[PDB]
Protein: phosphoglycerate mutase
Amino acid sequence: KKPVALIILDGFALRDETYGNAVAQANKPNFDRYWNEYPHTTLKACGEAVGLPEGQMGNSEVGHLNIGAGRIVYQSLTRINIAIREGEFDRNETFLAAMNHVKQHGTSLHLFGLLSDGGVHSHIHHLYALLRLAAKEGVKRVYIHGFLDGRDVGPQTAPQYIKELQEKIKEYGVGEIATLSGRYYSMDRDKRWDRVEKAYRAMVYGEGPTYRDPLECIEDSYKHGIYDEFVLPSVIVREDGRPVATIQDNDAIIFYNFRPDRAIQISNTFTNEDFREFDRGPKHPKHLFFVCLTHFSETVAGYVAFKPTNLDNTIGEVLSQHGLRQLRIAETEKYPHVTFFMSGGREEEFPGEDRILINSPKVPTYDLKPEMSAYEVTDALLKEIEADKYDAIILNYANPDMVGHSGKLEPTIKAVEAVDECLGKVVDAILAKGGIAIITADHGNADEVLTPDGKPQTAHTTNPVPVIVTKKGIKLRDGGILGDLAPTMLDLLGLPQPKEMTGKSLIV
Ligand SMILES: O=C(O)[C@@H](CO)OP(=O)(O)O
Ligand SMILES: [Mn+2]
Ligand SMILES: [Mn+2]
Structure:
């Protein structure tokens, strides 16, 4: 059994500038020798090359979606942007049905989601659009529950988004900031229900740090070293001390996040008839008209503003169609990406598809444990390899990305070095079994964890990702894109390429 392994170094991209560049500064003997001894190239992992607006940096969802589809996969950010551009956004039956619900039943419209222009999980402009739509539709009570970013944008940039939103509110003549919470709580994806609950109780019970002024809230949190991403779920109150608004029975909610991994948990908390993760309390809200900007999960009992579209014949499906055994493996943080997103937005495994989930460390932030669970993932996978069970493997090492999001150089360097020690063990074990490895990344991040002035850089970058095919005697094209990865693997696998995969094998 000669396995072909797709190894994704999450957040590992190529950048000449070495300042604050953890990828370039890390000692990567393994990665370096493979780059030197095998055919390599780089791929466009951002902008139109991956289905996003030009200039928009990539991410795990976009990257893994494109990597597995073998075609340029059109993304939500782009599609919704166009909807707003073409005057289609205001015509959305779901947005309107939700607005009709509050007016007809005299309830309130709640708007929550990532408050920034990161463009990864949402865009603050989409919120402005909903607000103007709400005003246009004559919806009296509209409340904003903002989730502070700091991960897709500057670590202490909330004030400007809050400031701009307030200005927009005044201008549209509708809306009220009710709560402010760090995406660390309201947008968790690691089933850390303790985090989720904090966000939930602030929004439904007005429990959490209280302020009259949204900006005084952020100021106070900064004062305690707590920045945007980790801001404690707080409540904005009126002059009489009462919360500006809590989510109640028959209210409508429009979750304006278009990325699913970090939206399913809080969405389930609000819509699940029987929720057990934790006790929502007897007076928790029911009969909520819940709207998801895009599809999150079958579990969320709500509606979908922008319906999803099938992604047929992705690598996972082609591999399955030809009777091959495939294994998806990664630790928690990137488990959703190597499965759901890699499978083209599919939850169910394909026949013949095995998945291994290795739990990420129990640390608040990963700069605290840069090697994360890389070694366990590696150990786990090395065993599978000895077993001779899989024809195809899709491995994702989360470290470069996960610890690079801390905006810290030394821990990210360690992160990269840990992954390298691991990368060598895996590629060396695959070559020994006669297989071949495709070493790559889904986008940048670790290549820049410090701003030119040395401040923490906590988000992705727009640089190109590396590509190494451990097969002597071949040449790789140069202007490729992620959507070319699937075709290359199939080529290596000698499996035929489906017409759906409009990508092109990198092998000359
Ligand atoms: O952590 C996340 O949700 C994003 C950043 O907002 O990173 P990635 O796309 O790598 O998952
Ligand atoms: Mn990623
Ligand atoms: Mn990331």
Remarks:
- The CA atoms of residues 39 and 391 lie 22 Å apart.
- The domain at 75-310 is CATH 3.40.1450.10 (2,3-Bisphosphoglycerate-independent phosphoglycerate mutase, substrate-binding domain).
